[PDB]
Ligand binder design. Structure first.
Ligand SMILES: [Cl-]
Ligand code: NA
Length: 127
């Protein structure tokens, strides 16, 4: 599915992402907008052979097993296919692991380049 902004904010809140590890909800909405355009089926192939999956574009080099990323790890203990459903639970639970791993939300390329250092609370305005 492709979420609307406030619909996704509400779903992320129901999944406990709001203020997770101190990151307010707007951070997560901004990250999803710029990673995937709020699209649970988004995929992106990288020139290192890894792929980014799902609404938070979680990458197969470290976080999920797709069977095709040489020498990679699977720290979320899931197949990457689980990140390509319309239910965001697997993405949220893996994001919670990622964000607790030692670099916070800096693991997300789109967040660190396009969200961090902006007024991210604006992403939940009107919701
Ligand atoms: Cl604004
Ligand atoms: Na992997």
């Amino acid at each position: 599915k492709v979420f609307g902004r406030c619909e996704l904010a509400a779903a992320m809140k129901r999944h406990g992402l709001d203020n997770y590890r101190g990151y307010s909800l707007g951070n997560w909405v901004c990250a999803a907008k710029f990673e995937s355009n709020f699209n649970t089926q988004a995929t992106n192939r990288n020139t290192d052979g890894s792929t980014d999956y799902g609404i938070l574009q979680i990458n197969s080099r470290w976080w999920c097993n797709d069977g095709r990323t040489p020498g990679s790890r699977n720290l979320c203990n899931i197949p990457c296919s689980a990140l390509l459903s319309s239910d965001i639970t697997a993405s949220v639970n893996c994001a919670k692991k990622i964000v607790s791993d030692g670099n916070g939300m800096n693991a997300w390329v789109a967040w660190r380049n396009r969200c961090k250092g902006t007024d991210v609370q604006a992403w939940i305005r009107g919701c």
